[PDB]
Protein backbone atom coordinates (compact mmCIF):
# COMPACT_ATOMS: atom_id res chain seq x y z
CA UNK A 133 0.00 0.00 0.00
CA UNK A 134 0.75 3.72 -0.15
CA UNK A 135 3.27 4.56 2.55
CA UNK A 136 2.02 6.25 5.69
CA UNK A 137 5.33 6.92 7.43
CA UNK A 138 7.56 9.99 7.43
CA UNK A 139 11.07 8.57 7.98
CA UNK A 140 13.08 11.68 7.10
CA UNK A 141 15.52 13.10 9.62
CA UNK A 142 14.62 16.70 10.55
CA UNK A 143 16.70 19.62 9.35
CA UNK A 144 16.19 23.20 10.49
CA UNK A 145 17.41 26.54 9.18
CA UNK A 146 16.90 29.97 10.70
CA UNK A 147 14.88 32.16 8.31
CA UNK A 148 14.07 35.76 9.24
CA UNK A 149 14.34 34.85 12.94
CA UNK A 150 12.10 31.79 12.61
CA UNK A 151 12.99 28.11 12.47
CA UNK A 152 11.94 26.34 9.28
CA UNK A 153 11.95 22.57 9.02
CA UNK A 154 12.86 20.75 5.83
CA UNK A 155 13.58 17.32 4.39
CA UNK A 156 17.03 17.00 2.81
CA UNK A 157 17.99 13.65 1.24
CA UNK A 158 19.85 12.34 -1.76
CA UNK A 159 23.33 13.13 -3.02
CA UNK A 160 25.04 16.35 -2.03
CA UNK A 161 26.44 17.45 -5.39
CA UNK A 162 24.36 18.02 -8.50
CA UNK A 163 21.33 20.25 -9.00
CA UNK A 164 18.82 19.96 -6.12
CA UNK A 165 15.09 19.30 -6.45
CA UNK A 166 12.95 21.63 -4.33
CA UNK A 167 9.50 20.30 -3.35
CA UNK A 168 6.93 22.91 -2.31
CA UNK A 169 3.67 21.84 -0.59
CA UNK A 170 0.45 23.84 -0.29
CA UNK A 171 -2.66 24.05 1.82
CA UNK A 172 -3.24 22.30 4.25
CA UNK A 173 -0.33 19.93 3.85
CA UNK A 174 3.40 19.85 4.63
CA UNK A 175 6.46 17.99 3.44
CA UNK A 176 4.43 14.95 4.48
CA UNK A 177 2.61 15.20 1.11
CA UNK A 178 5.89 14.40 -0.71
CA UNK A 179 6.83 11.41 1.49
CA UNK A 180 6.07 8.80 -1.21
CA UNK A 181 7.38 10.75 -4.20
CA UNK A 182 10.79 11.74 -2.83
CA UNK A 183 12.03 8.10 -2.56
CA UNK A 184 11.83 7.80 -6.38
CA UNK A 185 14.05 10.86 -6.82
CA UNK A 186 16.43 10.72 -3.86
CA UNK A 187 18.48 7.84 -5.35
CA UNK A 188 19.86 10.19 -8.02
CA UNK A 189 19.09 13.77 -6.89
CA UNK A 190 19.08 15.90 -3.78
CA UNK A 191 15.54 16.39 -2.48
CA UNK A 192 14.76 19.42 -0.33
CA UNK A 193 11.18 19.66 0.95
CA UNK A 194 10.49 22.58 3.32
CA UNK A 195 7.47 23.08 5.52
CA UNK A 196 6.06 26.54 4.77
CA UNK A 197 6.25 28.93 7.71
CA UNK A 198 3.43 28.27 10.19
CA UNK A 199 3.03 24.71 8.85
CA UNK A 200 4.53 21.28 9.30
CA UNK A 201 7.35 21.39 11.86
CA UNK A 202 8.33 24.98 11.09
CA UNK A 203 7.84 27.76 13.64
CA UNK A 204 4.51 29.58 13.94
CA UNK A 205 5.09 33.33 14.22
CA UNK A 206 2.18 35.72 14.67
CA UNK A 207 1.61 36.57 11.01
CA UNK A 208 -1.41 37.06 8.84
CA UNK A 209 0.09 34.32 6.65
CA UNK A 210 -0.75 36.19 3.47
CA UNK A 211 0.79 34.87 0.28
CA UNK A 212 3.37 37.65 0.63
CA UNK A 213 4.40 36.34 4.05
CA UNK A 214 5.14 32.95 2.48
CA UNK A 215 6.96 34.66 -0.42
CA UNK A 216 9.23 36.45 2.05
CA UNK A 217 10.00 33.31 4.03
CA UNK A 218 10.58 31.06 0.99
CA UNK A 219 12.82 33.64 -0.69
CA UNK A 220 14.92 33.68 2.48
CA UNK A 221 14.85 29.88 2.99
CA UNK A 222 16.24 29.36 -0.51
CA UNK A 223 19.04 31.83 0.16
CA UNK A 224 19.75 30.50 3.67
CA UNK A 225 20.40 27.06 2.12
CA UNK A 226 22.76 28.57 -0.46
CA UNK A 227 20.83 27.05 -3.35
CA UNK A 228 21.86 28.33 -6.76
CA UNK A 229 20.22 26.42 -9.63
CA UNK A 230 17.23 24.25 -8.73
CA UNK A 231 14.51 22.08 -10.18
CA UNK A 232 11.09 22.85 -8.69
CA UNK A 233 8.38 20.28 -7.81
CA UNK A 234 5.35 22.23 -6.73
CA UNK A 235 1.71 21.90 -5.74
CA UNK A 236 -1.21 24.11 -4.76
CA UNK A 237 0.13 27.20 -2.92
CA UNK A 238 3.62 25.81 -3.29
CA UNK A 239 3.13 26.22 -7.03
CA UNK A 240 2.32 29.90 -6.63
CA UNK A 241 5.46 30.26 -4.53
CA UNK A 242 7.58 28.34 -7.03
CA UNK A 243 6.14 29.96 -10.15
CA UNK A 244 6.48 33.44 -8.62
CA UNK A 245 10.09 32.66 -7.65
CA UNK A 246 10.98 31.22 -11.06
CA UNK A 247 9.46 34.23 -12.84
CA UNK A 248 11.71 36.47 -10.76
CA UNK A 249 14.81 34.24 -11.07
CA UNK A 250 14.45 32.33 -14.34
CA UNK A 251 18.19 31.72 -14.70
CA UNK A 252 18.06 29.62 -11.50
CA UNK A 253 15.26 27.28 -12.52
CA UNK A 254 16.23 24.29 -14.69
CA UNK A 255 12.81 22.70 -14.68
CA UNK A 256 9.41 22.82 -13.03
CA UNK A 257 7.23 19.83 -12.17
CA UNK A 258 3.80 21.00 -11.10
CA UNK A 259 0.31 19.66 -10.39
CA UNK A 260 -3.04 21.03 -9.15
CA UNK A 261 -1.52 24.50 -9.22
CA UNK A 262 -2.65 28.10 -8.64
CA UNK A 263 -4.12 29.69 -11.76
CA UNK A 264 -6.64 32.53 -11.99
CA UNK A 265 -10.12 31.04 -11.61
CA UNK A 266 -12.18 33.36 -13.85
CA UNK A 267 -15.57 32.83 -12.23
CA UNK A 268 -16.97 30.69 -9.46
CA UNK A 269 -18.47 28.48 -12.18
CA UNK A 270 -14.86 27.35 -12.77
CA UNK A 271 -14.53 26.21 -9.15
CA UNK A 272 -15.77 22.62 -8.65
CA UNK A 273 -19.50 22.62 -7.95
CA UNK A 274 -19.20 20.11 -5.09
CA UNK A 275 -16.90 22.48 -3.16
CA UNK A 276 -18.20 25.87 -4.31
CA UNK A 277 -20.46 27.03 -1.50
CA UNK A 278 -17.93 25.94 1.10
CA UNK A 279 -14.99 27.78 -0.42
CA UNK A 280 -17.25 30.80 -0.75
CA UNK A 281 -17.98 30.59 2.98
CA UNK A 282 -14.26 30.05 3.61
CA UNK A 283 -13.69 33.54 2.21
CA UNK A 284 -15.45 35.36 5.05
CA UNK A 285 -14.31 36.39 8.52
CA UNK A 286 -17.40 35.08 10.26
CA UNK A 287 -18.44 31.72 8.79
CA UNK A 288 -15.07 31.07 7.13
CA UNK A 289 -13.18 31.35 10.40
CA UNK A 290 -15.70 29.30 12.38
CA UNK A 291 -15.28 26.45 9.89
CA UNK A 292 -11.50 26.65 9.45
CA UNK A 293 -10.13 27.97 12.75
CA UNK A 294 -12.73 26.79 15.26
CA UNK A 295 -13.77 23.52 13.66
CA UNK A 296 -10.61 22.67 11.62
CA UNK A 297 -12.70 21.90 8.53
CA UNK A 298 -9.83 22.34 6.08
CA UNK A 299 -8.03 19.41 7.78
CA UNK A 300 -11.01 17.29 8.86
CA UNK A 301 -13.08 17.69 5.68
CA UNK A 302 -11.47 19.64 2.85
CA UNK A 303 -8.23 17.63 2.93
CA UNK A 304 -9.97 14.20 2.61
CA UNK A 305 -12.33 15.70 0.03
CA UNK A 306 -9.22 16.56 -1.99
CA UNK A 307 -8.10 12.92 -2.24
CA UNK A 308 -10.01 10.27 -4.17
CA UNK A 309 -8.79 7.28 -2.21
CA UNK A 310 -9.54 7.11 1.53
CA UNK A 311 -6.92 8.50 3.90
CA UNK A 312 -5.99 6.26 6.83
CA UNK A 313 -6.20 7.40 10.44
CA UNK A 314 -2.39 7.44 10.63
CA UNK A 315 -2.22 9.80 7.64
CA UNK A 316 -4.92 12.03 9.08
CA UNK A 317 -2.98 12.28 12.32
CA UNK A 318 0.14 13.33 10.40
CA UNK A 319 -1.81 16.09 8.67
CA UNK A 320 -3.48 17.08 11.96
CA UNK A 321 -0.30 17.36 14.01
CA UNK A 322 0.78 20.96 13.16
CA UNK A 323 -2.71 22.31 13.83
CA UNK A 324 -3.84 20.76 17.12
CA UNK A 325 -4.04 24.26 18.62
CA UNK A 326 -6.83 26.35 16.99
CA UNK A 327 -4.79 29.58 17.09
CA UNK A 328 -2.21 27.89 14.86
CA UNK A 329 -4.73 27.51 12.00
CA UNK A 330 -4.48 31.05 10.57
CA UNK A 331 -2.55 29.80 7.47
CA UNK A 332 -5.35 27.34 6.69
CA UNK A 333 -7.90 30.18 6.51
CA UNK A 334 -5.75 32.90 4.93
CA UNK A 335 -4.77 30.63 2.02
CA UNK A 336 -8.30 30.05 0.59
CA UNK A 337 -8.90 33.77 1.08
CA UNK A 338 -5.90 34.44 -1.18
CA UNK A 339 -7.04 32.09 -3.96
CA UNK A 340 -7.43 34.14 -7.17
CA UNK A 341 -11.13 33.52 -7.82
CA UNK A 342 -13.43 35.83 -9.79
CA UNK A 343 -10.85 38.63 -9.72
CA UNK A 344 -10.51 38.51 -5.87
CA UNK A 345 -8.19 39.33 -4.30
CA UNK A 346 -7.01 41.66 -7.07
CA UNK A 347 -3.36 41.67 -5.97
CA UNK A 348 -3.07 37.89 -6.02
CA UNK A 349 -4.86 37.69 -9.37
CA UNK A 350 -2.36 40.08 -10.93
CA UNK A 351 0.59 38.24 -9.38
CA UNK A 352 -0.58 34.85 -10.66
CA UNK A 353 -1.47 36.28 -14.09
CA UNK A 354 2.12 37.57 -14.28
CA UNK A 355 3.75 34.22 -13.68
CA UNK A 356 1.24 32.52 -15.99
CA UNK A 357 2.22 34.96 -18.74
CA UNK A 358 5.85 34.00 -18.10
CA UNK A 359 5.03 30.29 -18.07
CA UNK A 360 3.27 30.56 -21.44
CA UNK A 361 6.48 32.02 -22.92
CA UNK A 362 9.43 30.60 -21.05
CA UNK A 363 11.39 27.66 -22.51
CA UNK A 364 11.91 26.22 -19.01
CA UNK A 365 11.32 22.46 -19.04
CA UNK A 366 7.85 21.70 -17.65
CA UNK A 367 6.23 18.55 -16.26
CA UNK A 368 2.46 18.76 -15.56
CA UNK A 369 0.60 16.04 -13.66
CA UNK A 370 -3.19 16.05 -13.71
CA UNK A 371 -6.05 13.84 -12.53
CA UNK A 372 -9.76 13.39 -13.09
CA UNK A 373 -11.76 15.30 -12.05
CA UNK A 374 -9.03 17.49 -10.50
CA UNK A 375 -9.98 20.57 -8.47
CA UNK A 376 -7.80 23.55 -9.39
CA UNK A 377 -6.95 22.00 -12.78
CA UNK A 378 -9.78 20.06 -14.51
CA UNK A 379 -8.78 17.76 -17.38
CA UNK A 380 -9.89 20.31 -20.02
CA UNK A 381 -7.53 22.90 -18.53
CA UNK A 382 -4.68 20.40 -18.23
CA UNK A 383 -5.26 19.63 -21.92
CA UNK A 384 -4.98 23.27 -23.00
CA UNK A 385 -1.84 23.79 -20.94
CA UNK A 386 -0.10 20.71 -22.34
CA UNK A 387 -0.54 22.16 -25.84
CA UNK A 388 0.21 25.84 -25.11
CA UNK A 389 3.00 25.78 -22.49
CA UNK A 390 6.40 25.41 -24.19
CA UNK A 391 8.53 22.31 -23.51
CA UNK A 392 5.75 20.81 -21.39
CA UNK A 393 5.02 17.11 -20.96
CA UNK A 394 1.69 16.24 -19.30
CA UNK A 395 1.06 13.05 -17.32
CA UNK A 396 -2.37 11.63 -16.50
CA UNK A 397 -2.19 10.14 -13.01
CA UNK A 398 -5.69 8.65 -13.21
CA UNK A 399 -8.30 9.52 -10.59
CA UNK A 400 -7.41 12.56 -8.57
CA UNK A 401 -8.80 15.68 -6.93
CA UNK A 402 -6.27 18.11 -5.40
CA UNK A 403 -3.68 16.04 -3.50
CA UNK A 404 -2.53 14.03 -6.48
CA UNK A 405 0.47 12.85 -4.44
CA UNK A 406 -1.93 10.88 -2.28
CA UNK A 407 -3.69 9.17 -5.18
CA UNK A 408 -0.76 8.09 -7.41
CA UNK A 409 2.60 8.82 -5.76
CA UNK A 410 4.46 6.05 -7.58
CA UNK A 411 3.64 7.41 -11.03
CA UNK A 412 4.36 10.99 -9.95
CA UNK A 413 7.66 10.02 -8.34
CA UNK A 414 8.80 7.69 -11.10
CA UNK A 415 7.92 10.26 -13.79
CA UNK A 416 9.76 13.10 -12.02
CA UNK A 417 12.88 10.92 -11.85
CA UNK A 418 12.65 9.93 -15.52
CA UNK A 419 12.02 13.52 -16.59
CA UNK A 420 14.98 14.75 -14.51
CA UNK A 421 17.33 12.37 -16.29
CA UNK A 422 16.47 14.18 -19.55
CA UNK A 423 17.41 17.64 -18.23
CA UNK A 424 20.74 19.46 -18.60
CA UNK A 425 21.35 19.51 -14.85
Ligand SMILES: [Cl-]
Nearest residue numbers: 171335336339
Ligand atom coordinates in the same frame (compact mmCIF):
# COMPACT_ATOMS: atom_id res chain seq x y z
CL1 LIG B 1 -6.36 27.15 -0.26
